[PDB]
Ligand SMILES: Cc1cc2nc3c(=O)[nH]c(=O)nc-3n(C[C@H](O)[C@H](O)[C@H](O)COP(=O)(O)O)c2cc1C
C-alpha cells in the first residue's frame with residue numbers, strides 16, 4: 528500500500544491517503560464561512576480528504592471567537608460554497624462537528640449562560656473573546672454548570688441537527704470531535720467526570736455519552752458517512768486520565784461494531800511529544816488499534832501528530848496506519864500532496880498567523896511552480 532494511492536473510508540472515496548487535519552483558524556466572523564475561507568479550502572483540495580476546522584453544532588457548543596458554526600442558515604450556505612469548490616477540484620471534505628463543553632466563556636454562550644459539562648468543575652484554560660470589532664481576546668474559561676439528563680438529550684438532538692446540516696451543506700460526511708479535552712472527552716476522563724448516575728463511575732458508564740452521540744449521528748446520516756477523532760493521552764484543556772488504556776480499548780471495541788467510516792487518532796500530546804503519558808504506564812497504540820480490528824472494525828485508520836514525509840510513507844506501507852493527517856504542514860503548504868510525491872522542499876508555517884487575522888498566513892502561502 529502507498530501513501531499516494533486511493534483509499535476507501537465508509538461511503539467516502541479518497542483519491543490519496545494524505546489527510547488535512549482539522550485546524551481552527553478563527554477567520555469566520557459571525558460564525559459564518561465566507562469567501563476568503565472558500566479560497567483557503569479550495570487551494571488544498573488536492574488532499575485525499577479534508578477535515579474542516581472544528582464547527583460547533585450550536586452556540587452552546589462554541590468556545591472561541593470567529594469560529595464557523597452549523598447552527599445558522601447563512602452558515603450552511605457559506606459551507607455549501609466551500610464544499611462545492613472542493614468537489615469541483617475533485618476533493619473530498621468532512622465537517623468536524625464540535626462541542627467544547629466546559630472550555631468556553633459566558634459571552635459566547637446563549638443568554639450569557641454558563642458553559643455545560645458532565646460535572647461543574649472549572650478549567651484552567653484560555654479563550655478568544657472578540658471585543659466589539661475589535662479586538663481584545665484572551666480570557667479565562669468560565670465556571671460551568673453540570674448537565675441534567677434532559678440536557679444531554681437536547682445535546683444529542685443538537686448533534687442530530689448538526690449532522691443533517693452538514694449533508695445539507697454538501698459535506699461528504701462528518702467527523703465527531705471527541706478529542707483534546709472537550710465535551711465528549713469531559714465525560715470519558717476521570718478528572719472531569721464525577722457524576723453519580725448512568726454517565727459516571729464505571730468505564731461503561733463514562734463511555735455512554737460518546738456512543739450515544741455516535742448512534743444519534745449515524746442514525747441521521749448513516750454509519751458509512753460518520754467518523755470520529757480521539758486523543759487517548761492528550762493533556763489539552765486541563766484534562767487528566769488515570770488509566771487511559773482500559774478506557775480507550777473499551778471505546779474502540781464498541782466502535783468496531785458500529786460500521787464507522789473512519790477513526791482519527793491523535794498519537795501523543797496534541798502539538799506535543801508523541802510518547803506523552805498522563806498516567807503511570809505508557810499507551811499502547813498497536814493494542815489500541817487491534818481492539819478496534821478484533822471487534823470487527825473496518826473503518827479507515829487515520830493517524831496524526833509529528834509525521835514527516837519519511838515517517839508517513841513507512842507507516843502506510845507497513846500497514847500500521849491506513850492514512851496520515853498533517854496539520855501544520857497543510858497550513859504552510861496548500862499543494863502538500865504534490866510536494867510530497869515530488870520530494871520537493873516544504874514551506875514553513877508562521878506561528879503568529881495561526882489564529883485570527885486575514886489573508887496573511889492563511890491564503891498567501893505559495894504553491895509549487
Ligand atoms: C492552529 C491549529 C489549530 C488546530 N485546530 C484543531 C481543531 O480544530 N480540531 C482538532 O481536532 N485539532 C486541532 N488542532 C490539532 C491538529 O489537528 C493536529 O492534531 C496537530 O496539532 C497538527 O500538527 P501535526 O501536523 O504535527 O499533526 C489544531 C492545531 C493547530 C496548530
Ligand SMILES: C/C(=C\[N+](=O)[O-])c1ccccc1
Nearest residue numbers: 550551581591706707797882
Ligand atoms: C480547536 C482547537 C484545539 N483543538 O480542538 O485541537 C483550538 C482552538 C483555539 C485555540 C487553540 C486550539
